[PDB]
Amino acid sequence: MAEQINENYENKQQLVEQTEITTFENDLIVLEDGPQMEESLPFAFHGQHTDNRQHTVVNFLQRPQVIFDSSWASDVPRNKQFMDSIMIPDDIISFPMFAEKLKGFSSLRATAVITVQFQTQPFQAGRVMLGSFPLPTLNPTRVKFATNHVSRLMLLNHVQCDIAKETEVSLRIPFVSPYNSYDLVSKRFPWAKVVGLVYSPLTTTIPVDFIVYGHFEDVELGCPTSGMLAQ
Amino acid sequence: SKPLLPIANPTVLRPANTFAITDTNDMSHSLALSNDTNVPFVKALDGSGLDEMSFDYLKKIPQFIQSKFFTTTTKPQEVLFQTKVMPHYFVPGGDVTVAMDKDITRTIWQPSHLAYITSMFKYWTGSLVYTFKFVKTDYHSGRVEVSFHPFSDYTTGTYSDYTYRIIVDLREKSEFSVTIPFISPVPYKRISRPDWDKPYSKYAHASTGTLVLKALTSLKATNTVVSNSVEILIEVNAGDDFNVIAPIENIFFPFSLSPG
Amino acid sequence: SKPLLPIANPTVLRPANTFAITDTNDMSHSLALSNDTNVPFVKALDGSGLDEMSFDYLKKIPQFIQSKFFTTTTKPQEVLFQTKVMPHYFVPGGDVTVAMDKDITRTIWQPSHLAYITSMFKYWTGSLVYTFKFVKTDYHSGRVEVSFHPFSDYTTGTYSDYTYRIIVDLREKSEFSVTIPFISPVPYKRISRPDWDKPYSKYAHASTGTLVLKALTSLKATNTVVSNSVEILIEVNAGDDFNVIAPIENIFFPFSLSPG
Amino acid sequence: SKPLLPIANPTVLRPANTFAITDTNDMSHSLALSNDTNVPFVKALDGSGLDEMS
Amino acid sequence: SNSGTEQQNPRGSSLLTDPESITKSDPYNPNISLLISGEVFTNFRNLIKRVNFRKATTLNGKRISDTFDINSLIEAPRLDIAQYVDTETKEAKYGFSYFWSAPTTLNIVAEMYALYRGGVRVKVVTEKGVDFVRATVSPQQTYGSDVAPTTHISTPLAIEQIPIKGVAEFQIPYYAPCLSSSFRANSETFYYSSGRNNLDIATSPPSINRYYAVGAGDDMDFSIFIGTPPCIHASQTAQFTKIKQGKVYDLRYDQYDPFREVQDGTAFLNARSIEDSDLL
Amino acid sequence: SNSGTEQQNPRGSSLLTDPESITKSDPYNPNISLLISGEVFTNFRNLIKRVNFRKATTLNGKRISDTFDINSLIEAPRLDIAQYVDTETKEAKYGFSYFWSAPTTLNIVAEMYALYRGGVRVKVVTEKGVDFVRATVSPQQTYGSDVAPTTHISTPLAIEQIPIKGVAEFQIPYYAPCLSSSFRANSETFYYSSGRNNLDIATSPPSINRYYAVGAGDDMDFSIFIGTPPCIHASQTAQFTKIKQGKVYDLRYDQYDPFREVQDGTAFLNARSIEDSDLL
């Protein structure tokens, strides 16, 4: 170390107070005041505005979020879509509950959970397949050939539903990328494209309704950031 | 010092190590910073400890190979499904169909998951797992008979009562999946171009026998609330002892697509 | 004795050992008195035990990369300094400017210390250390905000309150030096031709993010005794975890000069 | 590191190992999946432990 | 049992456990691959080590260099549609074609996976009279510059001498910023997931024909299963339709392998690579 | 803290300890160079072992010898200014040029240091038909004599046979009176700090073209850091201005490397090496 003999300036190591993220390092004097001898009212007196629980930013990501709520009739046959495709996590984190929370974070590394409900009165038949093609923006050459046909989707990571047996279905998609995380400020490198095909058509006129939920588990949030890019 | 040296063993020199071999050594130059510079193996890149490259993982993935129907006009003892017992099939409607001109279209039949994975080998063995899905309600009904005829065909004079069979009562039940063992006079059978419409007596070198899904009954259903048709959905899985040897063949050449 | 000999292992012969490799062996002839004649390593030739050849020593040497000013006309929230977080820069005025003819002059922009040392590699990683000198007295005054925006730019709608920042009160204080960590989606970023006037969204492959030195205040100063301008002097140091890989590039060719 | 190397023993090279010999070694390439890929000896194929080749 | 109301054989269950046998007994026979084959096959990680020929450079001149991307070798080559015109009757016949290319053992495995990690092995076969062959990698893009240098001073160099070693074997390491890289084409441009590398094979004296055989380096590893690729029947190589000026093979191919016969098929007139949007 | 009145990051302090992180926490990530690169880089002492091509001898005749100084190879070659004249319009265009030379991996490191210590490795590539190559060192100056001998009887001799080993590799030891020697030009004449050595590469039969590649011997060591050298942009190799008779590349270079293409730049008219006094 270059040695330094200082006697005219105090190594003012106090007047240095980090508050969560921001570090103030001050000269002259730091002052602080208010009403003295602070107490708090017991929890019976207030707390009619809160639940007996705390919510971090990791939940709010573990909450299921409705993506789709629609139907599909008997006119769609095998190997055709019954639901719109979902980009993971672009078509999930774009809902306001998640987007308002992920803001201020650099990136996200977590496994995503796509759950789908199915409505059936016991007179309806059919089967339906829910698969996920990994990294669709990195191998666009192969996307539509692995998702235009059942038996090329089901050898991928998939989840089936017998319409007259399963009323709920949930596929767990772990995070997978050439990278460590999912860039949030640029939304670069989605790690799967959920597609929904028809394994077998409906046998009656009555369509089937479905709800698509999506949440995350195993959540590792990145570094805090402003998150704004030029345009 | 510098003294002489005894003569060494007689050697024999090559232009290259053997391309064919998996192991032993390779004579290449390293373009890295140092010789034997290698990247460590990192597992569970895909999120799971299953070695997604292992043959014993790939072979155990179910895949749909053919659909049949089961209706209120089906007669008893009518065959619903009949296949040679063999791992390699064709994808039903997942053909590669490209346009050649304004009005010339050609179709390439595409390989099964098992067909592709065994495409580079010559012989196979082991048990197979055939899954049958019945897209129906609890208010359809029917008996099917899944009988494995190990050395023979299903023809006239073929009684299925000689053979390991399963008579499943499909009232509430909806699915069905059996491990069909490997029974053959040969420790291995031949990998081949798959053919649905062949008996066993032809392709006797590539299949163990024939399996048959046979109706024991018409499909019972009231027409005013449920349908008369129920689709049979067949999948093929490749057991646990499924072993594949002799890598001196190719049945399927793969290609990549161009971005459009 | 003189008996026969068994055949040896099949060998494969080369014209040269691999140029590319650092280690292993070399086939050259020794022109010395004996083979493997080598000079022992003697350390501290330079007077210190620091291995002046070690990358981890060279990388930790501060170097001035750009100057800015901080005046009594500076508005609050006005950016004083804004850079992509990256090790390689250009020397400000230390260009190689040679005369070509009686009136044709050309200028070669010259590489940073880090730029030159990483010039032969392809990817880098690790934390960087940005130093800010303020040539002033104890009778100037000012707040600056050094906020590290790891993935983004500094544009409109960019609040610096989201980011690790340091609000330093420059009354008596005169210098400032922070270790800016390595936060990126990639374990390594690209070495490149440095560009000051680019945002992060371009050069997204070579930089981690943008760092910004922003005024929180005008410069306070009485004009009858001290000046209104104070020069910001920025230096760049390369942390301690600064790791550099993939030696298959060249951005800068060095040359020697001729004695005049 | 990368230091020099001492000179080796003088060798003598052939186009082929000796056809005539039963033993020692053979220089061929293996067209199998791996080198020295060999089928184990199974005896009594003929129904008896007598080595019908002896 | 073998049947029921719950899904009797889902994917996640097939990976681990088999359903009950039709015999309601043990259905398994013991592994005897080592006893008949003389060798055991269990993992494609080992099988990709097998080196087969991949591409050939013919349509340039007598050059002293041949630069091309490395990740393109992990892909299987593009399949092309060939237009043939009858020199007599002037009607069109249509087939398939590999333009101076062919897949490898490596390419059969790599097309089932999404990402790769590890080094690629390249072995070259040249024509007669060539004395040397040299290999060097370079980054293809000096990032931030509109042009890349034509030389380098710190890159790897590796020299093989043909008339004493006829096959020039090289091993190209894994140099990419990310854990596991991508090897297929994409339109991503913000920052990159592939390690974009060139590889320059030189010949002294300069020559025309360069035959390349590719294989997996020891550290080769693929990451995410995605599925079986689009394939073409191998039997389609021998099927042909005859026209006036010669034979039209359904699967037309060049002398990519310097040791295979030249098939007696007439040259086409136009070539078009099958795009992903051409599939029906 | 991060700021204060004392110098917050002097040189002597930067060599040992880093300032506090902006996070006021641990800013360091673990080294994973071996996990992605597959290799670890820590010291330039090892990197200089990499051999790249350095010079070429073309402009002599069919000779049987080529004598030149050894320490000149540790220097980076001189950069020259090239005068081009348009054969049509007769106006001058001006660029840069390496006259039958180029720097090495070794030269990138050696130009940061003042003195050297250890042996230099020289590998030669010749043209066809050459059978042998011989290497010998000699002192360049019989001290006290106006002339040096043309032969020697106790010098080192080292013979490599090209048609069985195509690259003639030699290692030239460190023979100098002092602990660590100097390798750059100076006007010192009283007594000397460099070990002045010649190196004579012979060819049987005599040939014209000699291509030399240089690298660091095992015992290579540099002593005193002095600073970054004068550099030229590598991208300037591909930039060119077109004139009538051809292309004028900003960084013009010869076929120094017997495995690189010959760039399509017209010959210059005059060459001038940049002197230290030319810098402005």
Author numbering:
A (entry chain B): 1 to 231
B (entry chain C), C (entry chain C): 1 to 260
D (entry chain C): 1 to 54
E (entry chain A), F (entry chain A): 1 to 280
Paper text:
The virus belongs to the genus Triatovirus from the family Dicistroviridae, which is part of the order Picornavirales. Viruses from the family Dicistroviridae have nonenveloped icosahedral capsids that protect linear single-stranded positive-sense RNA genomes 8,500 to 10,200 nucleotides in length. The major capsid proteins VP1 to VP3 of dicistroviruses have a jelly roll β-sandwich fold common to capsid proteins of many other viruses and form the capsid shell with pseudo-T= 3 icosahedral symmetry.
The virion has pseudo-T=3 icosahedral symmetry with 60 copies of each of the viral structural proteins VP1, VP2, and VP3. VP1 subunits form pentamers around the 5-fold axes, whereas VP2 and VP3 subunits constitute alternating heterohexamers around the icosahedral 3-fold axes. A complete model of the major capsid proteins of BQCV could be built except for seven C-terminal residues of VP3. Each of the protrusions is formed by the C terminus of VP1 and CD loops of VP1 and VP3. However, no density corresponding to VP4 could be identified in the virion structure. SDS gel electrophoresis and mass spectrometry analysis showed that VP4 subunits are present in both native and crystallized BQCV virions.
